[PDB]
Enzyme design. Structure first.
Site, PDB file in Angstrom:
ATOM      1  N   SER A  46      33.363  29.571  43.195  1.00 42.30           N
ATOM      2  CA  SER A  46      34.472  29.374  42.272  1.00 42.30           C
ATOM      3  C   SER A  46      35.823  29.364  42.977  1.00 42.30           C
ATOM      4  O   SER A  46      36.861  29.489  42.317  1.00 42.30           O
ATOM      5  CB  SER A  46      34.453  30.455  41.191  1.00 42.30           C
ATOM      6  OG  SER A  46      33.668  30.058  40.081  1.00 42.30           O
ATOM      7  N   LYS A 194      42.153  34.196  46.096  1.00 41.53           N
ATOM      8  CA  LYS A 194      41.272  33.478  45.185  1.00 41.53           C
ATOM      9  C   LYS A 194      39.832  33.773  45.574  1.00 41.53           C
ATOM     10  O   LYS A 194      39.484  33.741  46.758  1.00 41.53           O
ATOM     11  CB  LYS A 194      41.534  31.967  45.212  1.00 41.53           C
ATOM     12  CG  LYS A 194      40.751  31.177  44.172  1.00 41.53           C
ATOM     13  CD  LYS A 194      40.822  31.829  42.800  1.00 41.53           C
ATOM     14  CE  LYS A 194      40.038  31.033  41.770  1.00 41.53           C
ATOM     15  NZ  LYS A 194      38.716  31.652  41.473  1.00 41.53           N
ATOM     16  N   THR A 195      38.999  34.053  44.578  1.00 40.54           N
ATOM     17  CA  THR A 195      37.649  34.550  44.803  1.00 40.54           C
ATOM     18  C   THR A 195      36.610  33.456  44.582  1.00 40.54           C
ATOM     19  O   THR A 195      36.906  32.357  44.109  1.00 40.54           O
ATOM     20  CB  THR A 195      37.357  35.735  43.881  1.00 40.54           C
ATOM     21  OG1 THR A 195      36.905  35.251  42.609  1.00 40.54           O
ATOM     22  CG2 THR A 195      38.612  36.549  43.674  1.00 40.54           C
ATOM     23  N   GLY A 196      35.369  33.787  44.931  1.00 40.20           N
ATOM     24  CA  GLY A 196      34.244  32.900  44.717  1.00 40.20           C
ATOM     25  C   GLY A 196      33.014  33.651  44.251  1.00 40.20           C
ATOM     26  O   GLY A 196      32.370  34.351  45.038  1.00 40.20           O
TER      27      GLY A 196
END
Length: 240
Positions: A46, A194-196
């Site tokens: 993501s 920002k993450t995933g």
């Protein structure tokens, strides 16, 4: 140059969770590169939603009024992880609000809409090729490529002064990434990340130390939140 002796604790970390770990960091005030598997294929999960709003920010420069353009909803685009999408359903939502929802909350429904008004998934590929990213593909990128790309958009001269600082303020407000790179810094340091979320996870961030040059980095894994945070500490301290 402590970049030779950091490979030992990095291999310790990636052998304590099973899979591989790719890490790259860059010093703006010097150029120190702590690299470790930073040029390997890593799932983006993501984390593309961070560059999705960046492509949207680039569109609004030569397409004035783009960000205030609102979108109405139905159900052919409603998917799980809809914190702000379904919360503002029939009321509509602007493109600017659609981008703030997909970055600061990893909204999987708002990301589908911004993808349509970009030409589809390949529309994001066109933006990343336009700035210099040649590793971006359909979603994979190297932890180094994520670092230089994020460096140009937030720090370098790639997004205009309004859209660049807006991108910075959009990463500073991200909430899903406190247990990762945000925890691995002094609390007084400004951080935008920002993450995933896929198990396999990752996180790229820009760190602002108090009165010092900012740092861009990327920590990518594949099999885990404390693992990314620990790998961040290694890259941060690894810069001698």
């Amino acid at each position: 140059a402590l970049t030779n002796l950091v490979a030992e604790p990095f291999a310790k970390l990636e052998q304590d969770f099973g899979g591989s770990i790719g890490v790259y960091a860059m010093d703006t005030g010097s150029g120190a590169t702590v690299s470790y598997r930073a040029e390997e294929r890593f799932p983006l999960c993501s984390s593309f939603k961070g560059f999705l709003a960046a492509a949207v920010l680039a569109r609004s420069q030569q397409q004035a009024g783009l960000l205030d353009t609102p979108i109405r909803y139905g159900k052919n685009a409603l998917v799980p992880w809809s914190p702000i999408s379904e919360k503002y359903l029939t009321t509509g939502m602007t493109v600017a609000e659609l981008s703030a929802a997909a970055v600061q909350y990893s909204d999987n429904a708002a990301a589908n809409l911004l993808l349509k008004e970009l030409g589809g998934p390949a529309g994001l590929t066109a933006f990343m090729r336009s700035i210099g990213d040649t590793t971006f593909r359909l979603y994979t990128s190297s932890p180094r490529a994520v670092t230089e790309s994020l460096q140009k958009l937030t720090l370098g001269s790639a997004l205009a002064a309004p859209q660049r600082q807006q991108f910075v303020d959009w990463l500073k407000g991200n909430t899903t990434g406190n247990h990762r790179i945000r925890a691995a810094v002094p609390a007084d340091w400004a951080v935008g990340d920002k993450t995933g979320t896929c198990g396999t996870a990752n996180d790229y961030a820009v760190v602002w130390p108090t009165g010092r040059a900012p740092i861009v980095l990327a920590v990518y894994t594949r099999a885990s939140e404390a693992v990314i945070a620990a790998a961040a500490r290694l890259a941060l301290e690894g810069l001698g």
